[PDB]
Amino acid sequence: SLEKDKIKFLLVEGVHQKALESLRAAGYTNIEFHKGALDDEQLKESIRDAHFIGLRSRTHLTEDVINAAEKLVAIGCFCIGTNQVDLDAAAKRGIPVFNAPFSNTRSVAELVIGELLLLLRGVPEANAKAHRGVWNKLAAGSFEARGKKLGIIGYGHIGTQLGILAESLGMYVYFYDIENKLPLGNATQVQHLSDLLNMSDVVSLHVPENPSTKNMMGAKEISLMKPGSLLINASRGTVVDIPALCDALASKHLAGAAIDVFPTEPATNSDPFTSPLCEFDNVLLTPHIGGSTQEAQENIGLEVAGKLIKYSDNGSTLSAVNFPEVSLPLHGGRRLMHIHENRPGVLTALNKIFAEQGVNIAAQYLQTSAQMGYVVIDIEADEDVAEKALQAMKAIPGTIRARLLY
Amino acid sequence: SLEKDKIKFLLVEGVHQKALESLRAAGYTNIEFHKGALDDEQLKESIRDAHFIGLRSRTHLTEDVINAAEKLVAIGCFCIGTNQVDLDAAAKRGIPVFNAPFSNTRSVAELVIGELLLLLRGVPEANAKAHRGVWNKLAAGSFEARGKKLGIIGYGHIGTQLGILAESLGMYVYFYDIENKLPLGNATQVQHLSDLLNMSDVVSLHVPENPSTKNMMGAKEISLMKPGSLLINASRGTVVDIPALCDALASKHLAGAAIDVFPTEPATNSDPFTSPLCEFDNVLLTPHIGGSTQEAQENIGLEVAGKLIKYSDNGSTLSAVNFPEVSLPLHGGRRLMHIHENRPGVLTALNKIFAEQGVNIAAQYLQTSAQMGYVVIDIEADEDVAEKALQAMKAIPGTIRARLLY
Amino acid sequence: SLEKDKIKFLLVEGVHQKALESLRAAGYTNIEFHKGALDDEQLKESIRDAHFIGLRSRTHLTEDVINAAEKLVAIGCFCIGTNQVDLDAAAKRGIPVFNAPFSNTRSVAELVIGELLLLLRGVPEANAKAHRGVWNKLAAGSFEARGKKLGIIGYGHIGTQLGILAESLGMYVYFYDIENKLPLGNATQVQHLSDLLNMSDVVSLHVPENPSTKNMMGAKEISLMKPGSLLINASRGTVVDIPALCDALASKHLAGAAIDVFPTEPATNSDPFTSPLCEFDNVLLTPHIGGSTQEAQENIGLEVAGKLIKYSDNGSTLSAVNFPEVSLPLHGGRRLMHIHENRPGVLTALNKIFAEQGVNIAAQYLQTSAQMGYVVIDIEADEDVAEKALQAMKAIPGTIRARLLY
Amino acid sequence: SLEKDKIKFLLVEGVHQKALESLRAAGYTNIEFHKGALDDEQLKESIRDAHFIGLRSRTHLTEDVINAAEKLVAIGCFCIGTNQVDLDAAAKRGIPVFNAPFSNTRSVAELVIGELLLLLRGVPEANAKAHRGVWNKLAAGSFEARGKKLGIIGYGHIGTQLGILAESLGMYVYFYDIENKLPLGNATQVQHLSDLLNMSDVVSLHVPENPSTKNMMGAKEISLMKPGSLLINASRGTVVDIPALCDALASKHLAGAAIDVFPTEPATNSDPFTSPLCEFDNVLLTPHIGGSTQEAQENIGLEVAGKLIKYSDNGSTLSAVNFPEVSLPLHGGRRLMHIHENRPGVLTALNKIFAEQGVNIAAQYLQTSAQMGYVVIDIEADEDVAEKALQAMKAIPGTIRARLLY
Ligand SMILES: NC(=O)c1ccc[n+]([C@@H]2O[C@H](COP(=O)([O-])OP(=O)(O)OC[C@H]3O[C@@H](n4cnc5c(N)ncnc54)[C@H](O)[C@@H]3O)[C@@H](O)[C@H]2O)c1
Ligand SMILES: NC(=O)c1ccc[n+]([C@@H]2O[C@H](COP(=O)([O-])OP(=O)(O)OC[C@H]3O[C@@H](n4cnc5c(N)ncnc54)[C@H](O)[C@@H]3O)[C@@H](O)[C@H]2O)c1
Numbered sequence A, B, C, D: 001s002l003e004k005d006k007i008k009f010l011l012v013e014g015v016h017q018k019a020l021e022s023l024r025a026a027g028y029t030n031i032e033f034h035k036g037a038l039d040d041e042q043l044k045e046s047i048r049d050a051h052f053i054g055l056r057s058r059t060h061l062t063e064d065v066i067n068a069a070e071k072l073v074a075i076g077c078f079c080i081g082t083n084q085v086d087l088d089a090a091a092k093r094g095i096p097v098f099n100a101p102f103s104n105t106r107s108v109a110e111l112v113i114g115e116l117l118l119l120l121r122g123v124p125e126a127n128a129k130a131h132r133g134v135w136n137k138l139a140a141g142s143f144e145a146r147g148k149k150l151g152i153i154g155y156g157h158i159g160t161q162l163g164i165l166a167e168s169l170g171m172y173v174y175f176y177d178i179e180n181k182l183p184l185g186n187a188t189q190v191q192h193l194s195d196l197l198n199m200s201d202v203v204s205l206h207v208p209e210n211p212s213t214k215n216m217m218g219a220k221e222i223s224l225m226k227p228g229s230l231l232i233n234a235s236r237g238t239v240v241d242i243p244a245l246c247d248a249l250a251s252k253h254l255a256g257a258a259i260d261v262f263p264t265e266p267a268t269n270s271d272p273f274t275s276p277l278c279e280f281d282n283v284l285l286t287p288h289i290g291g292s293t294q295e296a297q298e299n300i301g302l303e304v305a306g307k308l309i310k311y312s313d314n315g316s317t318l319s320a321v322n323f324p325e326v327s328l329p330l331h332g333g334r335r336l337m338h339i340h341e342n343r344p345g346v347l348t349a350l351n352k353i354f355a356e357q358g359v360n361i362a363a364q365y366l367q368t369s370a371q372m373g374y375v376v377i378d379i380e381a382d383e384d385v386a387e388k389a390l391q392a393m394k395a396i397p398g399t400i401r402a403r404l405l406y
């Protein structure tokens, strides 16, 4: 309470107010909040003393920004991406990085729904023509979504939610996934992607970024799609062969697309964007905003404030992006934690401290990653016995950080 | 049917195939079908011997066209509008006009939902920018539709269906209507319009064209809207003060809008479109396509073919736009019908014909409308007797037209 | 009004208070109300001067009763059935009889839901045992209804509503009807009844009484049913061969049933009930209370009172069960009606009156049934002319009743 | 499954076939299956060499049976109850006991829906009467559930779900809970129980068994229920004062009830059931079958089999009922496991074994109960070496059991 006051959180790039509400609720009130991103002078000054930093996608925590922060304990990316942070550099210093990979789910699902509705109707091309003074009223080739088949590639957090939405609108939902998934509602798994692509009126992608998904929608897959169908990518920028898509659009094999993510994207809103897709009025182009709503920001705020509060209070590195994952349930007693290089005899040295000197260990959870190790230990002991054990632990060679949590 | 197969149907402007499937199923297989609209000296040609014509918005049935069409029995507008047809000229020749005023409801409702999804998310602005190479990634001001209030003005065919869909997406639905309607699901009627406009995040208009609705959305009504709300108009082009809309968009009191209908619309797709709204990237402009889908064309085909078929077969003029509405249930025997100027004791003359011939009249329905009268008569007689009766009927002063239906 | 105060409504057997509220709302305050049925004495004294009578099942309006009713204009059966009324006898006096055939829909549907839920779970039997002190706890043969197949025979007013409710509980809904129906929700028409019976976990019958449905669930059909399935009949008493059902229950081919209607039912609640089904604890037996709820009573009260009121106020006989159906839209002016035997010259006499009185007819709707005729006429004429014309009409040979409605 | 075939699963009392499907799918194929329970020598005979046993409520694993079960490794109760197992005899022999704590939420909720539908309609009494040949057709006091107010007491797993079903049926949902909960759908939390009771047409209980809950529905609370209402209890047998309920049934303050759980319940199905409630035909009495369905049995089978497989395969004791909870993520290498008396120095002796052989400990998770500890250890080492290590682990003082899992 007087000791949570010392614990500074630096929050930048205008994370959501529920982050700050979670912090204060947990007794953390020493907060330096900025709506904007910080130039370097300002970042380095504002971070020198910060125990925690929370950022979004534009703050760039390089190797050297990290070095400079002496108090820094953990990093929260209040967003999905973590490229902006040097993860090895943080890990080497016993600094876990957390993010929010799954707090954008509903925002993306609703986007795909709005977009496919308008695409099926030719509304993008008509709006584009209209704003340049061209009237293009017609019914031929425009369609209601009700009764049409949505083909969802990757039936995960978002695919799943999308399918539910689609069915509320009276669409028929099929999915393809590399795993066998349990369908929700009257969703149907399709074993082969070629089949999914043939049958679907709209195909939407909801997959990870990896070898298996890199240009998985190429010319072959695009031509397996139903004539006059529609492709929607708000997953990842590497999943569609964009030139192949341009050819399908130009040949009218597809009637439209909505693309929210691209192979290359502007670093800031000041930076110019270009895609060969720009020439097509029947394509919706959006600036990676599939998850950009206030509702999503809010879910993020809570989730990542939460992750940091829990690391701080009980040492949990569950979900950490660059760190051994450790979490122990809270069963009272005292809790210590120890971050280290995996040198011979660290663990030996640790349990020697307690055991040699009376102390029962109630619980212990160690996890490692290459030459990083992290262990959380619960002990049944006096206050001063714990404080002494801590000092001993800090001296074990290879020790990066040790802390008495409670 | 060796009579029905000589009843020519002229269908123009590529009405939906279901129109024709209906006709044929009903025994009417003599169908001259055109995908386009006809020049003059081929409309005159094709319609000279046509007993029925089905058309859409582009065929102008002027008085001259109508009076040169010798055999013309009825006219179907396979569309909402009837402005393209001279209804008085048709009436004066005993020719009923039918249309489809409510076959487009799911289409208009789905458009609005797609439009409000994207408007709430700033996507129209972003798309426009992106095609110009400007990247505008932000969450500020962007919202999921779930949990938001939709205010519907006009809780009729479309307003109702729209609220149902919105509720499916987890919106909260409210409506203002001048009449008191039973709500569907959890919709709520708002008594005062001021109160509905105050609470709404999105307001959508589904009202008829008249005195009560002309510019009902002026500067005053717009300013009562919640700051940062959205206005959608896919009802009628006279309902919104477009200048005052521009005011509120420029001032940023509204965050966007979607306008599908305008005070003055272009006559063809080759005529140019102007609006002050063309300057706002955050406005969706569409060319009166709210009901322009193939599924709507299907509904229209079925409906208006059904109205023609029924009139042909049984004399029903329900929903006729320019005629007294008569419909008589079927009970066998013969049916005859009489269209006449409204002079008195036409009914007298008629009932006299049958009394003299010893024919019992089983049922008879007369209705009158303006300077005009229409009666359908069920009698119990054979062929010769009914034909002889019919020739007598044709001879009555003020007779416009008469037929033996069965 | 001095008009309506003369117009006595005799209501017996305790129709819903909403009927009284409707009447009084419509200006009709002369009401004699009885909770029970009347003895012969009280019935003849009470109906002598009645313009309308509302009754239910028990009141027998025989030829002789009806002949004593000097003032009687119409009969309303505040129920489905009309056998308690001599309809030809009412017809000969020009007294239309109305009823309420579809006011019970929700109550029947809700009952089938409750019954199938408890049956699938073996509750009728477990409850029966428990009351006699036997504890029978088991999971074997008990099933949740979610994910099960309900087969509906007769997809009309009740079949439809039932399917909607079942789908709300996560059932799959299949139906067999003798005519092609449009499915609601995800319901599915099965063309062959044998297939529906093969697949269904619960079969429920919602068909009319006629040659086609007489013992249509016989031994054959019940053996086609799925093993361990359940049969529900709350349609009509003649539809299931009950001895065959008993055999299927005893052989355990079926796991239970719920019967609300029987080939022979008690006339009154004092009369004993017996069914060979009484032997089975896994059968729900109910005393024809499928439609017997206060909400149903209420719906009936509004419907039938409203039918009476419309006949009185505007002459409509739509849905009359024993009478020519006529109704004309209300377009102001004055309105006369004329009930008659179909004597030669009635109609020509009607005009002659309007000619020599100078009255222009705006609409006229005649319909006949056998030697019974009914015509409603709208005229443009002041009061004293309309009144003169009315007197002339009452004197046409074969006139049964003539009235000026407004 | 070379070495897995030696791992004998004994399943008694007819667990779902889904449990065996899970086992076979995990390579566990040596299964002794029984539909019933086993008598003593028959039990001791089958269990002696079993590595796992799956049972339900009737099989009593006493300290004597447990201590004779030579090869026994874990216990699966395919049910919620665990009192048939001596949890310490197990723990002290190093044997985790697993159960199924909520695999029946839908079954309870559906039961309540079915019950209230019929109670509202007076069907339990009509049915009972009908079977005795008494016919009671009436509409008085019978009600559709639609529009009625359901009052849920205890808005947890089952309460929540029940509210969702009820809303599907057009009911209004209210709940009382000792904590603030987030309502689902249009459910409404009521702060004072007395207000819930006064307003509810049907009251259903879904609370735990503790002192806050014992006879919480007493005379006072029932007297506060709405005159004519229905009480339902499928929660716990201690929660309703049963005599007070009988008073209220007899006085007709309540129109009916449905009771599934009783202060005292028959031990088996051949022991007699006694309740003053048996006199009442408008009470549904069921033998604690709220969660007794095949769907529940199937979920139980999956859950509890899965828990035994996971313990066998990877040593997870998550959700164990008598044991420290440990679960370590799989990351290859070898895994060992150690159960021991909770005393300082054990972990020190373990870690010393690996240090000596020059083997790195990749991860380890120790948790302690009161008297005992359990630790899972991941090492990077070949077969030979891990085996010599296991040998040494077994020899630590206080070791109860140790195993090389992979
Ligand atoms: N555009 C945006 O603003 C935005 C916002 C949020 C998330 N996303 C992205 O959406 C994608 C999906 O998100 P999520 O939360 O649903 O992910 P998820 O992990 O929950 O699901 C991804 C699914 O893809 C399946 N899958 C993996 N490889 C596949 C393959 N080659 N073919 C087919 N299916 C495959 C997986 O089995 C999994 O179910 C991610 O890349 C995520 O970062 C984008
Ligand atoms: N843009 C398109 O392509 C397209 C397509 C189909 C229909 N429409 C138009 O949309 C409108 C609505 O169609 P619909 O079938 O639902 O209409 P509807 O006639 O069924 O309902 C109109 C509703 O407005 C209410 N109302 C009338 N005046 C009002 C007033 N001034 N203020 C508030 N409420 C008022 C009425 O009570 C009624 O409920 C019509 O103008 C129709 O022609 C446009």
Ligand SMILES: NC(=O)c1ccc[n+]([C@@H]2O[C@H](COP(=O)([O-])OP(=O)(O)OC[C@H]3O[C@@H](n4cnc5c(N)ncnc54)[C@H](O)[C@@H]3O)[C@@H](O)[C@H]2O)c1
Pocket (backbone or CB within 6 Å): C080, C101, C102, C104, C105, C108, C153, C154, C155, C156, C157, C158, C159, C176, C177, C178, C179, C206, C207, C208, C209, C212, C213, C216, C234, C235, C236, C260, C261, C288, C289, C290, C291, C292
């Ligand atoms: N138990 C009760 O208290 C009670 C109450 C109200 C109604 N009912 C009865 O329930 C039945 C259904 O009522 P409703 O309002 O739904 O009637 P409905 O006419 O609207 O439905 C009957 C349906 O059955 C179909 N059908 C006719 N013959 C068939 C056949 N032989 N095989 C299969 N389908 C056939 C029809 O096409 C129609 O759709 C009626 O008999 C009615 O009197 C009973």
Ligand SMILES: NC(=O)c1ccc[n+]([C@@H]2O[C@H](COP(=O)([O-])OP(=O)(O)OC[C@H]3O[C@@H](n4cnc5c(N)ncnc54)[C@H](O)[C@@H]3O)[C@@H](O)[C@H]2O)c1
Pocket (backbone or CB within 6 Å): D102, D104, D108, D153, D154, D155, D156, D157, D158, D159, D176, D177, D178, D179, D206, D207, D208, D209, D212, D213, D216, D234, D235, D236, D260, D261, D288, D289, D290, D291, D292
């Ligand atoms: N009939 C059966 O065969 C059977 C089957 C399953 C469950 N049950 C019983 O159902 C009951 C509820 O099950 P669940 O899984 O929903 O439990 P749950 O713990 O999820 O919910 C209990 C709810 O009760 C509330 N609560 C506790 N004490 C209260 C009090 N005095 N007043 C008001 N609210 C109170 C809690 O806040 C919680 O929200 C349990 O007793 C359970 O064992 C019986």
Ligand SMILES: O=C(O)CCC(=O)C(=O)O
Pocket (backbone or CB within 6 Å): A056, A057, A058, A078, A079, A080, A081, A082, A291
């Ligand atoms: O938060 C940002 O600025 C980026 C949006 C986001 O969630 C991400 O993709 O990293």
Ligand SMILES: O=C(O)CCC(=O)C(=O)O
Pocket (backbone or CB within 6 Å): A139, B056, B057, B058, B078, B079, B080, B081, B104, B291, B292, B296
């Ligand atoms: O049909 C037309 O061509 C005019 C507008 C329209 O498409 C419709 O009436 O539905």
Ligand SMILES: O=C(O)CCC(=O)C(=O)O
Pocket (backbone or CB within 6 Å): C056, C057, C058, C078, C079, C080, C081, C104, C291, C292, C296
């Ligand atoms: O009318 C009755 O008295 C019994 C109920 C009935 O048949 C009905 O609801 O129509």
Ligand SMILES: O=C(O)CCC(=O)C(=O)O
Pocket (backbone or CB within 6 Å): D056, D057, D058, D079, D080, D081, D288, D290, D291, D292
């Ligand atoms: O123990 C059993 O056999 C099942 C009992 C059960 O499911 C329950 O008590 O809810």
